Amino acid sequence: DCNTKTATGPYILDRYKPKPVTVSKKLYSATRYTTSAQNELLTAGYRTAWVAYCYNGGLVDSNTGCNARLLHYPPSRDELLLWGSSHQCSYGDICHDCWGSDSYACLGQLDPAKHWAPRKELVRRDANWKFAYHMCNIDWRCGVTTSPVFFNLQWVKNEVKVSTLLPNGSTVEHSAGEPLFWTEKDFSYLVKDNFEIQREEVKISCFVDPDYWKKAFCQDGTNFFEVTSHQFCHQYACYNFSKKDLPFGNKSWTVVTASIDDLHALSAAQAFELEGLRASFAELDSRFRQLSEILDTVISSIAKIDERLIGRLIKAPVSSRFISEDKFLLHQCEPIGIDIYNFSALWYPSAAEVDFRGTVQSEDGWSFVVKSKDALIQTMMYTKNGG
Amino acid sequence: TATGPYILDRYKPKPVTVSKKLYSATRYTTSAQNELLTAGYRTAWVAYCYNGGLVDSNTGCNARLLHYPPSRDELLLWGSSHQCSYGDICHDCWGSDSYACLGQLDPAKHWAPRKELVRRDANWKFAYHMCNIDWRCGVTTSPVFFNLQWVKNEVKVSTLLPNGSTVEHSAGEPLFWTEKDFSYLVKDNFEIQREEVKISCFVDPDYWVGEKKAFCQDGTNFFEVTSHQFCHQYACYNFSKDEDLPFGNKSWTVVTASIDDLHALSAAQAFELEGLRASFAELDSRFRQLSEILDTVISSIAKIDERLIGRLIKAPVSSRFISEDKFLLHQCEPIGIDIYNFSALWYPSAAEVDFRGTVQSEDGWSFVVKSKDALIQTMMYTKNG
Amino acid sequence: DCNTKTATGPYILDRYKPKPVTVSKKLYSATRYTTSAQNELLTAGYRTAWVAYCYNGGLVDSNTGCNARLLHYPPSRDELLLWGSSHQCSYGDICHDCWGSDSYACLGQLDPAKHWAPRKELVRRDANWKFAYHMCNIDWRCGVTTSPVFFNLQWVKNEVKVSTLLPNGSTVEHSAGEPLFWTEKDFSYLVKDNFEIQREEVKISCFVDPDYWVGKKAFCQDGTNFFEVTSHQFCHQYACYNFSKDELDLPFGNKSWTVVTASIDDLHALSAAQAFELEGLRASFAELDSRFRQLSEILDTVISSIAKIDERLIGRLIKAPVSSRFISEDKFLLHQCVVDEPIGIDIYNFSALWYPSAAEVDFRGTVQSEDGWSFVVKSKDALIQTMMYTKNGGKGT
Ligand SMILES: *[C@@H]1O[C@H](CO)[C@@H](O[C@@H]2O[C@H](CO)[C@@H](O[C@@H]3O[C@H](CO)[C@@H](O)[C@H](O)[C@@H]3O)[C@H](O)[C@H]2NC(C)=O)[C@H](O)[C@H]1NC(C)=O
Ligand SMILES: *[C@@H]1O[C@H](CO)[C@@H](O[C@@H]2O[C@H](CO)[C@@H](O[C@@H]3O[C@H](CO)[C@@H](O)[C@H](O)[C@@H]3O)[C@H](O)[C@H]2NC(C)=O)[C@H](O)[C@H]1NC(C)=O
Ligand SMILES: *[C@@H]1O[C@H](CO)[C@@H](O[C@@H]2O[C@H](CO)[C@@H](O)[C@H](O)[C@H]2NC(C)=O)[C@H](O)[C@H]1NC(C)=O
Ligand SMILES: *[C@@H]1O[C@H](CO)[C@@H](O[C@@H]2O[C@H](CO)[C@@H](O)[C@H](O)[C@H]2NC(C)=O)[C@H](O)[C@H]1NC(C)=O
Ligand SMILES: *[C@@H]1O[C@H](CO)[C@@H](O[C@@H]2O[C@H](CO)[C@@H](O)[C@H](O)[C@H]2NC(C)=O)[C@H](O)[C@H]1NC(C)=O
Ligand SMILES: *[C@@H]1O[C@H](CO)[C@@H](O[C@@H]2O[C@H](CO)[C@@H](O)[C@H](O)[C@H]2NC(C)=O)[C@H](O)[C@H]1NC(C)=O
Ligand SMILES: *[C@@H]1O[C@H](CO)[C@@H](O)[C@H](O)[C@H]1NC(C)=O
Ligand SMILES: *[C@@H]1O[C@H](CO)[C@@H](O)[C@H](O)[C@H]1NC(C)=O
Ligand SMILES: *[C@@H]1O[C@H](CO)[C@@H](O)[C@H](O)[C@H]1NC(C)=O
């Protein structure tokens, strides 16, 4: 009996309304402090004498024996500057089995800067073969390195300092104009800045997200960082803007070694994010599929009234004639803009290209100190005597 | 003369079958991030000599290091007090004093925060024995990170050793062992918590790889689920019944990552970001194309419906076209139907993962290496002057 | 409604015109060279003798004393081969306090291959307790490892070589059939390739970005390996590539990056870059959802205008046999109850999206972390422990 029609409604077409996400792109003004170079110059030099003063009066004599030890003569600051420029180190006179009056060498002052060499290793000797006499052996080791080492910049009470990174995780703040010099046992160290700190007014792009877990993430060239306060530093750069740990002490992270396990952990976060993006790209593709179905239906409706529409859409010189709901034949027979879309420019991702520096202990300058220690152990392992 | 029939093609993307899930699971976590490692060492240098002149075959020295690693009860006391104990020192003790180098030594007669020995083997008293004894000792109490691990069907604490081995135990049972000069105590000042949770994962049913993969997030932890019973660092998971030889079997927590490995990971990131850039450019091109289609479409209907352009710009205007594109403007509870059927987009977000470092980098374990290096330096030569 | 008389225009509907971004996807043809396996075989062996030849003539005699020293006898290549297969090392005769005529063993050439053991550590002894006689002490250490070590491939003068990675950051390039053998102090080393380099013609997906500057870049994927192509002749880890060309650090002193340890600081910096990009993708996704929101508003208003004329349109959009009747601007009622296929016309001309995917990059660790090379350091450390003091107790005729 469906000669009669029924009526329901009224209805309305739903608009699409996504939950808003607040993160947005800011362009922050900042004063940026950077350096004209990315390395400090570490000059490290060492010098040690082995001094063995022995008396041989036979085993009955309680004075028979040896006073044999290492004595450190670390270079002074002036010496180290000359060692660095000449790539050579200096050492004292060698005494080989000196007895009698010649044995005084082991008792008097030692002049540690009488002979030069690029490197010098000592021989450990404590011979005592001359009965009723003292016997003296002296020999020297020395060496020097001049090596570039990376560094950080750092705010220290409202001024930008160079932060020299030490292999034990401590740091020493200083101005780019004041070299560091210190002595420790056999070694002296000179850290020099052959660069200056330049300041610039810059604009930094950041994404501020008030809905963490309030949090700003920024990019400056190949450097990426989370800005946590208005005075901020990252590696070689400090900024002023406008408007896990305790297993390692408070050691700088530049001396803590990453594990493969840490890389796996970072990799799995990447994997999760990329797969989510994959799922979201699938939904975006689905929306364009849906919009093409809606549009094709809408166009089919208007095109039956306006026989030029299809031709204008494909830029073909044809008018159309429909033979069904969807099938059609084709025959060949300056103003003011109004934006109805109001689209905002997309931010595009790009390859990050982060520079990596490695641990401070990996640097040649600092591993030179470890190599010096290892070589002393080898040469000291046993006496080179007739003893 | 006409051609056709034609039909408007619809856009048909190849389907991509990765989907978001909400999995139910039991999650085992712990109060604290760290175990407590107490490590203490103690060694005596003992040099027992006889000087009968070189004609006597008994002239010479029995000089050596002897280890007295602290017992469990001692290590507990060294831990709480931050001091170590050591025995009597003998400096050139001859005659009746030289017998201190014989028999049993009492290694716990004095206390110090730390103590290093001096190596001496003097023998200068003709016709007498001569005895030198000195001691080294030290203690550290250091937090060290751990993993949880399924053993049989229970969740154990996995203590990580610097050589890449691991020891599984309950959180309640401390580890204690002794090795040469050192004794080691691992205590857990925490308990394992049980909680029912829902974990968001993306399951990709066709993942290739030359051939079914699930990637999950739990807060700041991300992992690939590879079984129903699963652990990732400080947490173990039990999921419902739905859904390198160069290093030996070493725990990856002791293997150092190289800069080369970081470059490999960075290059992966760079490729994916550039592909995302290419895809964003295609997405922008599609919105460009849609705005051209819609403008042509609207311009056709707006000639029929002189109010339409007004509704599109929220204005009370009427329109009159003077050409195909150019126009003038004259001034002047329902049931929802959803024709779009859009699904919520998943949004990414900064994934701030915590890094732990190699076991060997931790202060607790490098204390062992530093004690070894310090003994080499003090033993380098005899102090007989 | 309306007062025609005056205003305004003419106006035109703006089209959306995005700034063009010029990174494009390529399939590059290349010759790829890979290997059957991902490890070389490092055989490393050491052997040393402690030899102490002493004379006791009392302290008045200037020849009283010792010639006590370590003497290295690194295995020959043939020895090393036998050590690796047997998993044993050889060493010479040992002498404990051999005095008088037996001290003869400390003189002349020592034969270092008389005994066998899986491993052997020496005792350091230089006793001299036999007055008016010589005394001889000899002992030996030896050890061997056979371990897999990872390697790179590398182009050397237009051929693919295997690149053996040494723990000091240098590398040795050689053909896969040329084993490496060298001797250094107490150690000899044999590096053997039990694999072949295989050639293959491939197509490689790359994204090429001609607008890539800092102050012309190509990023490729091949399986789980990702690399930036910097030249037509190019290697990445275990693979070398030759791309058709008509189609396209001071603190470490030039060491291979495979020996430079990554810091936690380095990881944080990469992590920070990931975070910035992901929050950018978040913001960009928000703009995408905004655009769909906006399109749904435009389409709804457009459909509302056409549907008043075409009462079947809405029924077709929801796939239902209904005609509509508008009762206001937005509100409407619904009333109910060969031969050739059509030629498709594509007005959209969308290109297929590239979809991201989890990258499962393999990590290799530092060379020094490998068991084969850490064996050398352990050998050195063990020698230091054994040599730390002489074990001269305690005998006498
Ligand atoms: C970066 O850090 C510096 C401080 O180290 C800030 O620079 C300061 O900028 C203010 C402007 O907001 C300057 O104050 C102005 O001084 C002039 C007279 O010199 C006065 O006429 C203005 O009314 C105002 O008081 C101030 O001199 C300047 N400080 C220094 C030491 O030069 C800056 O705000 C920080 N952040 C940025 C630039 O984003
Ligand atoms: C981490 O390492 C740094 C650098 O080695 C340590 O600081 C350094 O400490 C030494 C003492 O061991 C200082 O050398 C000495 O300085 C005094 C004072 O002038 C002098 O009398 C001595 O002759 C000797 O030269 C050295 O100056 C100092 N260096 C710096 C840059 O501060 C630091 O103590 C270590 N931290 C830990 C927790 O081990
Ligand atoms: C890795 O290190 C552990 C801990 O030092 C070693 O296990 C110890 O071995 C000593 C000596 O055999 C025992 O006295 C201890 O009881 C062991 N402790 C534990 C917790 O097991 C283990 O053998 C080492 N493995 C390797 C391959 O070096
Ligand atoms: C890399 O591939 C190219 C192209 O296949 C090789 O080019 C050959 O050598 C020269 C170009 O330098 C020309 O004769 C031809 O382009 C190629 N010759 C032949 C016979 O095809 C190039 O040799 C390859 N590189 C290596 C190292 O094999
Ligand atoms: C890095 O180590 C290699 C191997 O230990 C060094 O080269 C070997 O050592 C000496 C020096 O020339 C030669 O007798 C060997 O034959 C070398 N072998 C090989 C395979 O090269 C090399 O000199 C070291 N490099 C640095 C910069 O220290
Ligand atoms: C459909 O889109 C494609 C772009 O994806 C257009 O094809 C070529 O695009 C490249 C851009 O890399 C240009 O260099 C070419 O000039 C374009 N044309 C041709 C013929 O290759 C194509 O023009 C589009 N088709 C329509 C009808 O708009
Ligand atoms: C256009 O977008 C901006 C920001 O997205 C918004 O502030 C503004 O109100 C919008 N204008 C219209 C007419 O929708
Ligand atoms: C883990 O889940 C499985 C499957 O649901 C089941 O054996 C039980 O619920 C859990 N078992 C344990 C030991 O937690
Ligand atoms: C709407 O929801 C999903 C698409 O995400 C689909 O399963 C369902 O059939 C859709 N219904 C429609 C399009 O009417």
Q: A253 to chain B: nearest residue by CA?
A: B357
Q: Which residue has the tokens 């901020």?
A: A232
Q: Are the beta carbons of B280 and A348 separated by less than 8 Å?
A: yes
Task: Select from A221, A350, B283, B279 the least CA-distant residue to C217.
Answer: A350
Residue B195 Cα distances to B147, B192, B235, angstroms: 18, 10, 11
Q: CB B262 to CB A356 under 8 A? A: yes
Report d(CA C395, CA B60) in Å as an integer. Answer: 10
Q: What is the resolution of this structure in A?
A: 2.1
Neighbours of B205 (CB within 10 A): 11
- HSE, CB side, 13 Å, CA atoms: give it for residue C54: 29
Give backbone dihedrals phi and psi of C36, rounded to 5 degrees, phi first: -60, -45
Relative to the CA of C290, which ligand 7 atom is closest? 5
For a mutational test of ligand 7's pocket, the pick from A342, A344, A347, i.e. the residue with the most ligand atoms closer than 8 A to its C-beta, is A342
Contact C262, B257 (CB under 8 A): yes
Question: Measuring from atom 9 of ligand 9, which residue has the nearest CA?
Answer: B341
* Chain C residue nearest residue A309, CA to CA: C347
CB-CB contact of A276 with B348 (8 Å): yes
Entry field: residues in chain B: 385
Q: Nearest Cα to A360, choosing from A39, A10, A12? A: A39
Of A262, B232, A153, give the one whose Cα is nearest residue C271.
A262
Q: Do residues C371 and C145 lie in contact, with contact meaning Cβ atoms separated by under 8 Å? A: yes
* Spatial separation of the C-alpha atoms in residues A262 and C304, rounded to whole Å: 57
Nearest by Cα to A301 from C347, C298, B290, C307? C307
Whether residue B161 has its Cβ less than 6 Å from ligand 3: yes
- C254 torsion bin: left (phi>0), alpha (psi -120 to 50), beta (else): left
Spatial separation of the C-alpha atoms in residues A210 and B101, rounded to whole Å: 72
Q: Measuring from atom 2 of ligand 5, which residue has the nearest CA? A: C168
A248 and B363 in contact by Cβ < 8 A? yes
| Residue pair A223/A356 in contact by the 8 Å Cβ criterion | no
The three state secondary structure string of B8-42 is ECCCCCCCCCCEEEEEEEEEEEECCCCEEEEEEEE
Q: Which helix (H) or strand (E) holds A310?
A: helix A309-314
Distance CA B257, CA C363 (A): 8
Report the C-alpha gap between A36 and C395 in whole angstroms. 70
Provide the CA A89 distance to its chain's centre, in angstroms: 33
Give the residue from A101, A137, C302, A26 showing the smallest Cα distance to B381. A137
Check whether the bond before A58 is cis (ω within 30° of 0).
Answer: no
Which helix (H) or strand (E) is C380 found in, with range? helix C371-387
Using CA of residue A71, residue A77, residue A79, residue A85, what is the dihedral sign? Answer: positive
The phi, psi pair for C154, rounded to 5°, reads -160, 140
Residue to mutate, A73, A77, A170, ligand 2, most ligand atoms under 8 Å from C-beta? A170
Q: State residue B179 phi and psi, 5-degree precision.
A: -145, 110
Please, which residues have CB within 8 angstroms of residue C241's CB and are 6 or more apart in sequence? C30, C31, C32, C33, C204, C229, C233, C234, C235
Question: Which chains have 3 or more CB–CB distances shorter than 8 Å to chain A?
Answer: B, C
Q: What is the dihedral of CA C13, C14, C15, C19, to 10 degrees?
A: 180
> What's the token pair of residue B346?
């998943």
Please say whether the beta carbons of B46 and B66 come within 8 A. Answer: yes
Alpha-carbon span A192 to A178, nearest angstrom: 8
- Placement of tokens 């050398």 in the chain: C376
d(CA C66, CA C126): 7
Q: Which helix (H) or strand (E) element contains residue C348?
A: none
Q: How far apart are CA C367 and CA C256, in angstroms?
A: 10
Between helices A260-305 and C264-309, what is the axis angle to 10°? 10
Q: How far apart are CA B61 and CA B130, in angstroms?
A: 9
157-196 in chain C: CB under 8 A from chain B: none
Closest Cβ–Cβ partner in C11, C59, C387 for A131: C59
Tokens of A148: 């570039």
Cβ neighbours of residue C230 closer than 8 Å, sequence gap 6 or more: none
Structure determined via: X-ray
Tell me how long chain C is: 397
Amino acid at residue number B101: C
Structure tokens that stand for B273 in this block: 């970001």
- For the Cβ of A345 lying below 6 angstroms from any atom of ligand 7, the answer is no
Residues 73-112 of A with CB under 8 A from B: none
How many whole angstroms separate alpha carbon A41 and alpha carbon A164? 10
Closest ligand to Cα A313: 6
Binding-face residues of B in 277-316 toward C, CB within 8 A = 277-295, 297-299, 301, 304-305, 308-309, 311-312
For residue B328, with 0-12 CB atoms within 10 Å meaning exposed, 13-18 middle and 19 or more buried, which class applies? middle
Q: Are C191 and C48 in contact (CB under 8 A)?
A: no
Helix axes C264-309, B259-304, angle to 10 degrees: 10
The per-residue b/e assignment along C213-239, b for 16 or more CB within 10 angstroms, e otherwise, is eeeebbbbbbeebbbbbeeebbbbbbb
Cα separation of B350 and A270, whole Å?
10
C174-to-C80, C168, C177 alpha-carbon distances in Å: 20, 18, 8
**Nearest CA owner, ligand 8 atom 13:** B153
Instruction: Name the nearest CA neighbour of C66 among C121, C103, C108, C94.
Output: C103
N-terminal to C-terminal alpha carbon distance within chain C: 133
Torsion of CA C113, C117, C123, C125, to 10 degrees: -30
Beta carbons of A133 and A126 less than 8 angstroms apart: no
Give the DSSP H or E segment for B359. none
B290 CB neighbour count, 10 Å cutoff? 23
Q: For residues A49 and A140, give the distance between their C-alpha atoms in angstroms, rounded to a whole number.
A: 4
CB of C242 sitting under 6 A from ligand 4: yes
Q: Where are the alpha helices (DSSP H) in chain B?
A: 72-81, 259-304, 308-312, 363-378
Q: CB B255 to CB A270 under 8 A?
A: no
DSSP calls for B196-264: EEEEEEEEES---TT--EEEEEETTEEEEE-SSEEEETTEEEEE-S---GGGTT--GGGSBPBHHHHHH
Take residue A237 and report the two structure tokens written for it.
């750069």
Q: Is A340 in the pocket of ligand 7 (CB under 6 A)?
A: no
DSSP code of A248?
G
Is some CB atom of chain B closer than 8 A to the CB atom of C69? Answer: no
Nearest CA to ligand 8 atom 3: B240
Task: Give the count of Cβ contacts less than 8 A between chain A and C.
Answer: 331
Name the neighbours of B, counting chains with at least 3 Cβ pairs within 8 A.
A, C
> In 3-state terms, what secondary structure has residue C175?
coil
d(CA C383, CA A381): 9
Tokens of C82: 């036998």
Give the neighbor-by-neighbor strand order of the sheet with B317-321.
A336-338, C11-13, B327-331, B317-321
Indicate the helix (H) or strand (E) that contains A282.
helix A260-305
- Give Dmax over CA atoms of chain A in angstroms: 141
